[PDB]
Scaffold this motif. Sequence first.
Motif, PDB file in Angstrom:
ATOM      1  N   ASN A 180       0.821  -1.203   0.000  1.00 36.57           N
ATOM      2  CA  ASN A 180       0.000   0.000   0.000  1.00 36.57           C
ATOM      3  C   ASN A 180       0.859   1.258   0.000  1.00 36.57           C
ATOM      4  O   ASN A 180       0.531   2.231  -0.670  1.00 36.57           O
ATOM      5  CB  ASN A 180      -0.945  -0.002   1.209  1.00 36.57           C
ATOM      6  CG  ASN A 180      -2.084  -1.005   1.068  1.00 36.57           C
ATOM      7  OD1 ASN A 180      -2.824  -1.244   2.014  1.00 36.57           O
ATOM      8  ND2 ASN A 180      -2.230  -1.584  -0.116  1.00 36.57           N
ATOM      9  N   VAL A 181       1.952   1.240   0.754  1.00 38.94           N
ATOM     10  CA  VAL A 181       2.840   2.385   0.797  1.00 38.94           C
ATOM     11  C   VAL A 181       3.270   2.685  -0.629  1.00 38.94           C
ATOM     12  O   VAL A 181       3.370   3.845  -1.042  1.00 38.94           O
ATOM     13  CB  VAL A 181       4.075   2.089   1.634  1.00 38.94           C
ATOM     14  CG1 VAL A 181       5.188   3.086   1.308  1.00 38.94           C
ATOM     15  CG2 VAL A 181       3.711   2.148   3.097  1.00 38.94           C
ATOM     16  N   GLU A 182       3.515   1.625  -1.388  1.00 43.73           N
ATOM     17  CA  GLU A 182       3.926   1.786  -2.766  1.00 43.73           C
ATOM     18  C   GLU A 182       2.782   2.155  -3.701  1.00 43.73           C
ATOM     19  O   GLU A 182       2.943   3.036  -4.541  1.00 43.73           O
ATOM     20  CB  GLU A 182       4.650   0.530  -3.254  1.00 43.73           C
ATOM     21  CG  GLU A 182       6.100   0.452  -2.763  1.00 43.73           C
ATOM     22  CD  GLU A 182       6.876  -0.686  -3.399  1.00 43.73           C
ATOM     23  OE1 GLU A 182       6.810  -0.834  -4.643  1.00 43.73           O
ATOM     24  OE2 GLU A 182       7.559  -1.427  -2.657  1.00 43.73           O
ATOM     25  N   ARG A 183       1.630   1.499  -3.569  1.00 45.53           N
ATOM     26  CA  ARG A 183       0.505   1.837  -4.443  1.00 45.53           C
ATOM     27  C   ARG A 183       0.227   3.332  -4.247  1.00 45.53           C
ATOM     28  O   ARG A 183       0.003   4.071  -5.211  1.00 45.53           O
ATOM     29  CB  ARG A 183      -0.751   1.000  -4.108  1.00 45.53           C
ATOM     30  CG  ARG A 183      -0.574  -0.530  -4.268  1.00 45.53           C
ATOM     31  CD  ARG A 183      -1.896  -1.274  -4.647  1.00 45.53           C
ATOM     32  NE  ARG A 183      -1.832  -2.751  -4.551  1.00 45.53           N
ATOM     33  CZ  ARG A 183      -0.961  -3.551  -5.184  1.00 45.53           C
ATOM     34  NH1 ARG A 183      -0.036  -3.053  -5.992  1.00 45.53           N
ATOM     35  NH2 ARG A 183      -1.014  -4.864  -5.009  1.00 45.53           N
ATOM     36  N   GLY A 184       0.293   3.775  -2.992  1.00 49.03           N
ATOM     37  CA  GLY A 184       0.040   5.167  -2.664  1.00 49.03           C
ATOM     38  C   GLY A 184       1.082   6.175  -3.111  1.00 49.03           C
ATOM     39  O   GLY A 184       0.735   7.224  -3.653  1.00 49.03           O
ATOM     40  N   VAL A 185       2.355   5.882  -2.880  1.00 50.65           N
ATOM     41  CA  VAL A 185       3.397   6.808  -3.289  1.00 50.65           C
ATOM     42  C   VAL A 185       3.380   7.073  -4.784  1.00 50.65           C
ATOM     43  O   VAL A 185       3.653   8.186  -5.213  1.00 50.65           O
ATOM     44  CB  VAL A 185       4.790   6.305  -2.918  1.00 50.65           C
ATOM     45  CG1 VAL A 185       5.844   7.137  -3.640  1.00 50.65           C
ATOM     46  CG2 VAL A 185       4.991   6.416  -1.422  1.00 50.65           C
ATOM     47  N   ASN A 186       3.061   6.061  -5.583  1.00 50.05           N
ATOM     48  CA  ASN A 186       3.034   6.257  -7.027  1.00 50.05           C
ATOM     49  C   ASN A 186       1.757   6.925  -7.536  1.00 50.05           C
ATOM     50  O   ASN A 186       1.743   7.476  -8.629  1.00 50.05           O
ATOM     51  CB  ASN A 186       3.297   4.933  -7.765  1.00 50.05           C
ATOM     52  CG  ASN A 186       4.778   4.505  -7.702  1.00 50.05           C
ATOM     53  OD1 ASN A 186       5.254   3.996  -6.682  1.00 50.05           O
ATOM     54  ND2 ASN A 186       5.507   4.733  -8.790  1.00 50.05           N
ATOM     55  N   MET A 187       0.684   6.891  -6.752  1.00 46.43           N
ATOM     56  CA  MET A 187      -0.543   7.550  -7.181  1.00 46.43           C
ATOM     57  C   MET A 187      -0.387   9.038  -6.885  1.00 46.43           C
ATOM     58  O   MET A 187      -1.229   9.852  -7.271  1.00 46.43           O
ATOM     59  CB  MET A 187      -1.772   6.990  -6.450  1.00 46.43           C
ATOM     60  CG  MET A 187      -2.113   5.533  -6.812  1.00 46.43           C
ATOM     61  SD  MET A 187      -3.801   4.959  -6.347  1.00 46.43           S
ATOM     62  CE  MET A 187      -4.448   4.378  -7.972  1.00 46.43           C
TER      63      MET A 187
END
Length: 222
Positions: A180-187
């Motif tokens: 999620n940290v990654e899905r979020g940082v890229n959005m």
Amino acid sequence: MMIMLDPFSEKAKELLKGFGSINDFMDAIPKIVSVDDVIERIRVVKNEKLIDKFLDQDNVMDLAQFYALLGALSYSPYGIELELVKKANLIIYSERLKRKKEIKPEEISIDVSTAIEFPTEDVRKIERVYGKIPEYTMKISDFLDLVPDEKLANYYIYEGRVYLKREDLIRIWSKAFERNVERGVNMLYEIRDELPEFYRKVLGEIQAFAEEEFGRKFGEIQ
């Protein structure tokens, strides 16, 4: 209670859905938390004692501090900055987590709950294999989705769900958080331009920390 266990939970979702869009929320964050406040959250990786002041904190302050770090990373999505953000928050969240009685389904982003009762029949067998009795249960498919290399064969399943020791819950849930940290940082890379001077400053403060952290353990011991 009302403490943030997962910044991506449905709870947190509607909590930050209130400031309007992710962009409106993003503009508000700098007007709520300072930079020294946010880095305060990251230095937890150093002094264990830093953890406590966080155990109980208003949820909006949490989300704000959290989504500040995430925005600061839209500018540097791979290195130890992404590594540190994950580690620090993972501790703050795990900690609060591992000390919760009931776990409201809206507080956590994966189908996990507490096992109140355990089938009388298998109690001993379980112990003569894992010592204690697992305290939690989780949706089988979530399990398969989060820890692909593992085998259900090594856990206890009952009434359609897998049971897990506190350790395993965290270990497993950690994989959902990091994703999620990654899905979020890229959005956040889409609008990473409309971000205030704030987010870029936070980023520089994290970099400075890592250097201090690295510079010390590599030139230490003497």
